[PDB]
Assembly symmetry: D2
Homo-oligomer: 331 residues x 4
């Protein structure tokens, strides 16, 4: 029993880790990747998704769609201070690029080349998956949720058959890029607000509440080397670029690894605390847009929030993650 | 002859506008996309097709069914002007039963209408925009959700699009809300996106103009004069449609004679010489609790043309154009 | 029966006309004038109120208070493009200033001099009037409504005993200084919003809907001369130059041929309400809009509890009744000023 | 000795703060103004007077009754932390019966309390502000409506006022709303006006600090040690007051030991050396639907000082100061 899903993301060094976990995890069957604006322009995140796939020798298997370039009703805002100009700083990609297979999505779409990629391309693919699902189709979202909101404006009747597992928000701690809000929400608050009203089964699987406790320590670096060096002398430099920037910008000693925890939730939900509640997304605030405001501490519930991993959860997460990195090294 | 597309929410005004645009020799209608507004987008789709079939063009013009709701707000129907169907006042059962297949299904390679999707029109419009020598012309007389959706998908096309709209109020107050007009206030974010996109945008027919363009009794008799001799049934249909539209406008707004809004937009593309025009910066209120959709002007760089008035002669030129088309349709429908 | 009232205003050429009508009307008994920010700084509108009174030989009778210098939660915004730098352009005030009596308000307050004037001075005065009223005490407001809002934050229990007659807003036509809103509301929308929630009996007596139809035409000019020239040629010169300064600016900025005279219509409503159409309704004041703050939004195009009366039109006859009242007062002032 | 005024909404914390400020030798309290918040301003007035009478000062310190509602919003009481009276946990009937006349009535020339008006304190404060060598010190631990009202009346006095406040949350989340603290969110426009006015404004005691300042068991025993030998009844009263405050904080927010918020503000004026401090630009959310009153910082010109933490030693210094005052009050009550 393996779970069909799609990934929506903005790679992004976290997003790269998340793609590795999701694609190589036996529990998941990734149907496609759609990229979004966020960290970088959606053209760069598209490229970075493909690079990730090619590195792990899957760029010829998984279709990658290039989604929307800006939020519904706001201006784009890149995050180059964590991720670099390319969106995946710290490595030379020139080889990975030159040896890059054709994107399977072009075949699904019947396109000659990438210049024909359009933001809504993924719609028909996802609609087939949603139709085929016995209960609900699973999306893992770890960037802005513009793409999914765009989709549900086009296919509103599909909302009730979609389950979203997201890295988004902050509830019991403060924000990152703004005082009380998290990057993914605040770049398109209207998107998430639309989704939470749509009838989607929505889980905040990995808010900052969890992910700020999931740090790439030196012990984690040595366990990666232990699992990968014997098979394949990139991943380290990538997590180190991500380390230098998080120290530079936020004064974290060890950087949090956000997005994979979302994928981990779909793989292994038993390791997560969960509560149902009503989440309001601030869209009107001048300085607080994207705040995730909850009734927990009487509007109906519209979401599940995971505030903490059960003890054991951190180790379960790293075990899962080191294993996948091991398998990729073998290949 | 000017290639264009129509975006609309029929709607009795929108029906009049489709007739003018399709039969005007100056225009070449490439497609019709329908939007939410007056009614659900499924009803406005149906009503667009009905209009086309009545005027014997439902087999020529492709009709797309666009988005069912605004970008970030709830839908709000206008059944108190237009009825439950969106085109009250007539029995459509014949026009429906004798309805040709929609040419859009052929372009799209679809078996049937149940496969129509809101973004279907995108690729069609992109080809038109690419082919245009200067800019491609869209006439918009409903919510501008569809065009905003399009420009989120094809942002680089904005600079090659020219929009001619029935929207807004500038120097007079609103209709459905105190200071705002229906088409803007149902999706203010849409129009706001458009005005920021680089589109060449013209407020061709705000309430400022259209409230002076009334279906009087004189207008009704000139319609009969131009149509009865060729097609009594068409006369019956068009008159009952404008009368339903009359009763409701009296009921809801206390107008003696109802304004005919949407055709004026098409008239602008046909015959711009009859319109006053000024360039300015338009801000759309999106934050106001009671004033969202207000068109606020500096009368900040210019982002729009506003037409505040017809030149003297303009009203007669408009009605002549409109009566002529109704005459031509009567000839085709026959006796 | 003569009606006790207070004036709140920002003179301002209209406000000057309104003070003349109110002070000399036999139907009204003006207890005080409080000035507010708006047209000019509140210190200038204070001065201009006093000047008006001194011109009409009443600066020693009517106390003038100097109210709040800025809105509750927004920045001040002067209107010098209609009114000039002084707030009362078009005449030389240097004589009227030199011969200026002590302000009776200083006596009520027990103040040595004007340097002690404070925005909330008028509060205790108004509270006594409100307490003494049999039904409600009448305020005529023709500037920002900051002062009254400030008062009701201090004396909230007095709201139910206050009746306000205002020159404010636009309902069935568009605005002046912003597309859909009128100056007096948009300079302090929160103030009016507080008032409409407070329990005050509030009347929009003179929106732009009415006042844009109340123009200083040539016929009006000749009737002023007829009523004033025989008694006081200089007063004729002064009042005309004042309405002419107001004419040049309104033509310059808004392309009016003949300028509207706004604020006196509010006072006229208290004098003679029979000349006004009136309807009760719910008015929402836009406070959140970026470009539309101060809009007066109602149900009134179409066919929440009522919180206001709106006067959309004068009854036919109303314009002439207004000018008769106004020219009579200008006549009486001419008699008193003399040659 | 530092001349100051207290603005507050007692409130159990506010009561503790009044005790510290009035009995601290470093401070000279000129007056107390009460505000809406925890309870109606009439109740917080009463509670301020009660506090003063308990500590035998109700005949010395004038108490003004300020504004009953925010500038542009509806009042919102906090009876779930503080009770119906605003000072639950004890019987005040004796303290009330034996209550001296309010010195403010004498300053104002008023027959009785029914004549108290929200703006009464204005002229008093203006004299203090004028007399100050540099700036006059206000300690604010409720809504800041009164001070905002004052600065609308006396805008030129802003540059001569220094405010030390218990307000806000910066690096942690809020209490009564997800990302905002009670005192700010009940009148965000007030604080926003103040930060634009030219006031020297210090967030001396945000939740960042006060959530680390808990009434533990050790603190309870030090209170008994300092007070029981002089005044058993005062011991009973102060303990029941902190216990009422304990039960409610556990009930509502699941705190083991309740934070004591407002005195930390007064402590800052007494002893600023124990506080970390940084200058920054604070924006107050006024437009947000669910986030009004958020203190958003650039951590635009600086408009405030923020104290994010006590220096190590600071907690003990605070409690020493606080236990000492409670000791001295016990001596006087007997
Ligand atoms: Ca990401
Ligand atoms: Ca329409
Ligand atoms: Ca005025
Ligand atoms: Ca307090």
């Amino acid at each position: 029993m393996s779970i069909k899903c799609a990934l929506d993301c903005d790679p992004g060094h976290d997003d790269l880790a998340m793609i590795m976990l999701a694609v190589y995890s036996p529990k998941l069957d990734v149907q496609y990747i759609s990229t979004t604006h966020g960290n970088q322009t959606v053209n760069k995140t598209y490229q970075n998704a493909r690079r990730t796939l090619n590195l792990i020798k899957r760029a010829d298997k998984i279709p990658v769609y290039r989604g929307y370039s800006k939020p519904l009703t706001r201006e784009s805002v890149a995050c180059p201070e964590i991720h670099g100009e390319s969106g995946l700083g710290g490595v030379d990609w020139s080889e990975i690029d030159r040896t890059m297979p054709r994107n399977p999505a072009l075949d699904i779409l019947g396109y000659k080349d990438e210049s024909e990629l359009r933001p809504d391309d993924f719609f028909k693919h996802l609609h087939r998956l949603v139709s085929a699902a016995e209960d609900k189709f699973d999306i893992i979202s770890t960037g802005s949720e513009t793409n999914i909101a765009q989709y549900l404006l086009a296919y509103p009747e599909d909302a009730k058959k979609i389950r979203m597992t997201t890295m988004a928000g902050n509830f019991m701690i403060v924000g990152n890029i703004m005082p009380f809000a998290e990057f993914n929400v605040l770049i398109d608050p209207e998107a998430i607000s639309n989704i939470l009203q749509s009838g989607v089964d929505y889980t905040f699987a990995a808010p900052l509440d969890i992910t700020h406790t999931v740090l790439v320590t030196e012990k984690v670096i040595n366990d990666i080397k232990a699992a990968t060096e014997p098979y394949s002398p990139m991943i380290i430099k990538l997590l180190f670029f991500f380390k230098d920037t998080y120290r530079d910008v936020f004064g974290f000693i060890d950087p949090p690894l956000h997005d994979p925890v979302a994928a981990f939730h779909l793989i292994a939900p038993e390791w997560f605390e969960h509560v149902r509640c009503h989440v309001d997304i601030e869209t009107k605030g001048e300085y607080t847009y994207g705040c995730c405001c909850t009734n927990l501490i009487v509007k109906p519930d519209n979401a599940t929030v995971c505030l903490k991993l059960k003890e054991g959860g951190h180790d379960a997460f790293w075990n899962q993650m080191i294993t996948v990195w091991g398998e990729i090294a073998k290949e």
